[PDB]
Amino acid sequence: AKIGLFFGSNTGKTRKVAKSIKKRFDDETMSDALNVNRVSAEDFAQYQFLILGTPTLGEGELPGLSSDCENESWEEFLPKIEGLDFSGKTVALFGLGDQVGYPENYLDALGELYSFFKDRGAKIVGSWSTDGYEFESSEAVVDGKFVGLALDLDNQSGKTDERVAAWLAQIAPEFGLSL
Ligand SMILES: Cc1cc2nc3c(=O)[nH]c(=O)nc-3n(C[C@H](O)[C@H](O)[C@H](O)COP(=O)(O)O)c2cc1C
Ligand SMILES: [Mg+2]
Ligand SMILES: [Mg+2]
Ligand SMILES: [Mg+2]
């Protein structure tokens, strides 16, 4: 497939969102939603286009064993790919979090993922307005916008599909999407 769709998850919400993205696209356009704990670095590296999802867990951390997840996740995956260059590749990110429960750390892990790929040369697309969210601080906010799609399936699950649909339309020119 042209676009690799990868996520990490501990209670399945990020997996559900990822599947809700893939259901919109055919198998030449997009890979099935793949948990990073099941992907090799070489397979991840094949894709010139990536859509990457993560929750924020612990407090402000990527999913993985150190944030008390059942299985390894993004925490243990990033070192496997940290020596790779993402220049010329296009990346869009989505984050899940709980803006009420974690008002000072909402979507922090989305910011960590953004930084990882930006520092390694990726072209990142898909920034998102902070309107309609209530929070105090987020490492995912850069220049007044979230660095990727912001979701909240604890407080705003009924907004997810509309948000995903609008975000996909926004990134469609960069990802060569037909909706
Ligand atoms: C122990 C724990 C810690 C969390 N920490 C944060 C946090 O720091 N920031 C945030 O935005 N959301 C936080 N959340 C909310 C989760 O990211 C949110 O519930 C998400 O939907 C979980 O996704 P998953 O089912 O894919 O694991 C936390 C949730 C739990 C259970
Ligand atoms: Mg097609
Ligand atoms: Mg297949
Ligand atoms: Mg190493």
Author numbering: 1 to 179
From the paper:
Azotobacter vinelandii flavodoxin II serves as a physiological reductant of nitrogenase, the enzyme system mediating biological nitrogen fixation. A. vinelandii flavodoxin II is a prototypical long chain flavodoxin with a non‐covalently bound flavin mononucleotide (FMN) cofactor. This cofactor can exist in three different oxidation states: oxidized quinone, one‐electron reduced semiquinone, and two‐electron reduced hydroquinone. When bound by flavodoxin, however, the semiquinone form of FMN is stabilized, which allows for the sequential transfer of one electron at low potentials.
The crystal structure of A. vinelandii flavodoxin II was solved at 1.17 Å resolution by molecular replacement using the model of the Cys69Ala mutant of A. vinelandii flavodoxin II (PDB ID 1YOB19). Following refinement (with statistics presented in Supporting Information Table S2), the root mean square displacements between the wildtype and Cys69Ala variant are 0.45 Å and 0.97 Å based on superpositions of the Cα and all atoms, respectively. No phosphodiester modification was observed in the structure, as has been reported previously to be present in A. vinelandii flavodoxin II;22, 23, 24, 25, 26 perhaps reflecting strain variations or differences in growth conditions. The Azotobacter flavodoxin II also has an insertion of eight amino acid residues (amino acids 64–71) near the FMN cofactor that is generally found in nitrogenase‐associated flavodoxins; these residues have been proposed to be involved in complex formation with the Fe‐protein of nitrogenase. In wildtype flavodoxin II, the Cys69 side chain points toward the interior of the protein near the FMN cofactor, so that formation of a disulfide‐bridged flavodoxin II dimer would require repositioning of this loop. The SG of Cys69 is in van der Waals contact (3.51 Å) with the CD1 methyl group of Leu57, and the presence of this non‐covalent interaction is likely reflected in the variations in the positioning of the FMN and residues 57–60 observed in this region between the wildtype and mutant structures. On reduction to the semiquinone state, the amide bond flips such that the carbonyl is placed in an “O‐up” conformation that is able to hydrogen bond with the protonated N5 position of FMN. The ambiguous electron density for the peptide bond between Gly58‐Glu59, as well as weak density for the side chain of Glu59 in the wildtype flavodoxin II structure [Fig. 3(D)], is indicative of a mixture of conformations that could not be cleanly resolved into components such as cis “O‐down,” trans “O‐down” and trans “O‐up” conformations for a Clostridial flavodoxin. Given the yellow color of the crystals, it is very likely that they exhibit an oxidized state, but the presence of some residual reduced forms from the anaerobic purification and/or photoreduction in the X‐ray beam cannot be dismissed due to weak electron density for Gly58‐Glu59.
